[PDB]
DNA sequence: CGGGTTTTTGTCTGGCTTCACACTTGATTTGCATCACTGTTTAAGACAGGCCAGATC
């Protein structure tokens, strides 16, 4: 738990609260940068490099059958690794409207450190899913075979019942679960008693056939449910089946950062417990055979900046290691507009 | 429906009235133009060479 500050190259404008950070091959990427793709780079996927503490967005030019997708800024996003890809969906494309699309992250070749990526597109049918942001995706392998769960987040009225006087109003997404077959790209929605009310900017555990949702803010009555829920697929021959279990244990948090540092061995770092309540204790999610074993390290060294600020954001590196940032100081002007910051969970 | 009872008008010739109004000419006011003066750069973003540095045959 080894926080330490980091510098930033001349495109840091580019970094915004809700981007991402996806990793192939032990290398990371930027996606989702700040308004529609400069002339600079037409694609926004950056090679995300640190080195030395200094970071070098620099482009990357997709393959020649890609799909120039636009910078989503709240995407659900799941590490595939079944050929190694990532699946990019829904968001807030920077007109401020709502993606129902999938995309696909392939490295369809790197020579020279030069990846050229491949972001192929797959639409849906049958129970296709609101779009919708906040939300979070994750695949389960069951029987060989396997899926995409999806617990929806919040999302904009229907197209009905919404009103200009409050046209960017939004609400929790009702609490479905999506299952996802990524082959024929097909959905099916499923209802679940013991889950009642929304969930966005929760956070989701995949182990191997079941899905760990815990934390999360919930719109409909503004709380923070601290109950996290197992959900248990199973892939018979026929029709696949879900089942929701809530677990004790839980943590009341939204948009907390998640990674993995050992195998089956994750960390949260901070989210937020109240509307003005900045997280600052981490929890280590000690997984198992079948039972979740919550517990927390030692609250990492935060400085007098993070303390005294009130927002944050960030992702997952991959390898044990988180990147948050911070904003500037408004009554010290002569700030970048950010500050920013890696600290590894070793 | 067209004929008849209200409001509303024409209407009297006298004497009354206030006041606009003829007709200069300079001394004022009032209207509407001019006038002299002020601020004392860039900040993002596209494209192009060019130099260098590291890769490759």
């Given at each position: 738990?080894?926080?330490?500050?980091?510098?930033?190259?001349h495109?840091?404008?580019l970094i915004?609260?809700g981007?991402?950070?996806?990793?192939?091959?032990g290398?990371?990427?930027?996606?989702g940068?700040?308004?529609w793709p400069?002339?600079?780079?037409?694609?926004?996927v950056?090679?995300?490099?640190?080195?030395?503490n200094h970071l070098?967005?620099k482009?990357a030019?997709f393959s020649?059958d890609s799909?120039?997708?636009?910078?989503?800024?709240?995407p659900?996003?799941?590490?595939?690794?079944g050929?190694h890809q990532?699946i990019i969906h829904?968001?807030?494309?920077?007109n401020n409207?709502?993606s129902d699309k999938?995309?696909?992250?392939?490295?369809?070749?790197?020579?020279?450190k030069?990846?050229?990526?491949?972001?192929?597109?797959?639409?849906?049918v049958?129970?296709?899913?609101?779009?919708?942001?906040?939300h979070?995706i994750?695949?389960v392998?069951?029987?060989?075979?396997?899926?995409g769960?999806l617990f929806?987040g919040?999302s904009?009225?229907?197209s009905?019942?919404?009103?200009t006087?409050?046209?960017?109003?939004?609400?929790d997404?009702?609490?479905?679960?999506f299952?996802?077959d990524?082959?024929?790209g097909?959905?099916?929605?499923y209802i679940?008693?013991?889950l009642q009310?929304?969930?966005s900017?929760?956070?989701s555990?995949?182990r191997?056939?079941?899905?760990?949702?815990l934390?999360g803010?919930?719109?409909?009555?503004?709380?923070?449910?601290?109950?996290?829920?197992?959900?248990?697929?199973?892939l018979?021959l026929?029709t696949?089946?879900?089942?929701c279990?809530?677990l004790?244990?839980g943590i009341?948090?939204?948009?907390?950062?998640?990674?993995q540092?050992n195998?089956?061995?994750?960390?949260?770092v901070?989210?937020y417990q109240?509307?003005?309540q900045?997280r600052?204790?981490?929890s280590?999610?000690?997984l198992?055979?079948?039972?979740?074993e919550?517990?927390?390290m030692?609250?990492?060294?935060?400085?007098s900046?993070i303390k005294?600020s009130?927002?944050?954001?960030?992702?997952?590196?991959?390898n044990?290691?988180i990147?948050?940032?911070?904003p500037?100081?408004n009554k010290?002007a002569?700030?970048?507009?950010?500050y920013?910051?890696?600290?590894?969970?070793?």
């Amino acid at each position: 738990m080894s926080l330490q500050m980091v510098t930033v190259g001349h495109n840091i404008a580019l970094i915004q609260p809700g981007f991402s950070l996806m990793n192939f091959d032990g290398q990371v990427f930027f996606f989702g940068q700040k308004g529609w793709p400069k002339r600079s780079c037409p694609t926004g996927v950056f090679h995300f490099d640190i080195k030395q503490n200094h970071l070098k967005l620099k482009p990357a030019i997709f393959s020649k059958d890609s799909c120039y997708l636009p910078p989503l800024r709240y995407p659900a996003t799941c590490s595939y690794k079944g050929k190694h890809q990532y699946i990019i969906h829904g968001g807030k494309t920077p007109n401020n409207e709502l993606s129902d699309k999938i995309y696909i992250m392939s490295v369809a070749c790197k020579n020279n450190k030069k990846v050229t990526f491949r972001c192929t597109e797959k639409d849906l049918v049958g129970d296709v899913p609101e779009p919708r942001y906040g939300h979070s995706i994750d695949v389960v392998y069951s029987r060989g075979k396997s899926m995409g769960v999806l617990f929806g987040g919040r999302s904009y009225m229907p197209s009905t019942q919404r009103t200009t006087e409050k046209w960017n109003s939004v609400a929790d997404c009702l609490p479905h679960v999506f299952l996802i077959d990524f082959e024929f790209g097909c959905a099916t929605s499923y209802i679940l008693p013991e889950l009642q009310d929304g969930l966005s900017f929760h956070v989701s555990i995949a182990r191997n056939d079941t899905v760990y949702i815990l934390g999360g803010h919930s719109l409909a009555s503004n709380i923070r449910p601290a109950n996290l829920y197992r959900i248990r697929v199973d892939l018979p021959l026929g029709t696949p089946a879900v089942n929701c279990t809530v677990l004790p244990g839980g943590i009341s948090v939204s948009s907390a950062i998640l990674t993995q540092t050992n195998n089956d061995e994750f960390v949260i770092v901070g989210g937020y417990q109240l509307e003005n309540q900045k997280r600052m204790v981490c929890s280590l999610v000690s997984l198992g055979d079948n039972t979740i074993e919550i517990s927390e390290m030692e609250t990492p060294d935060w400085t007098s900046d993070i303390k005294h600020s009130k927002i944050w954001f960030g992702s997952n590196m991959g390898n044990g290691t988180i990147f948050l940032g911070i904003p500037g100081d408004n009554k010290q002007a002569m700030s970048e507009a950010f500050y920013f910051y890696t600290l590894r969970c070793s």
